[PDB]
């Protein structure tokens, strides 16, 4: 006789799994434990505007945005 039972369980969020929990309890246990599975973002240099920072002048924040975006470009090109 030969018996081989392999179970691989991968969880993201919710109550941690173990063989002693039913699927109902796992599904109802996600009331507090939450994990972001998907997300979207925007480049950081696009929010830099005098409209976002009225305190600073125009050309100063413009140069700030220019150096930030060229830093990002150098960062992406290095790798």
């Amino acid at each position: 006789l030969s018996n081989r039972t392999n179970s691989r369980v991968q969880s993201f969020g919710g109550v941690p799994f173990y063989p002693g929990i039913t699927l109902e309890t796992w599904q109802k246990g996600i009331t507090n434990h939450l994990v972001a599975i998907d997300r979207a973002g925007l480049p950081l240099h696009f929010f830099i505007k005098p409209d976002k920072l009225p305190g600073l002048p125009g050309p100063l924040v413009k140069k700030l945005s220019k150096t930030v975006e060229t830093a990002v470009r150098h960062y992406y090109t290095f790798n």
């Binding site: 599975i37 997300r39 979207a40 150096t67 930030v68 990002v72």
Partner: protein, 50 residues
């Protein structure tokens, strides 16, 4: 905008105003390190189980 990030922008603007491109690039790289490349604008809270 968050206080630390605004302060970092203030420091970068002040360094640029002094006509110094040496420390400006280093500070920009440090800011990139501290605050990533993209600011998350939306997320999807959830769960998964395989």
């Amino acid at each position: 905008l968050s206080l630390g990030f605004t302060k970092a922008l203030m420091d970068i603007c002040d360094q640029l105003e002094k006509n110094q491109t040496k420390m400006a690039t280093y500070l920009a790289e440090l800011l990139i390190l501290n605050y990533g490349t993209h600011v998350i604008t939306s997320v999807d809270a959830g769960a998964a189980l395989v």
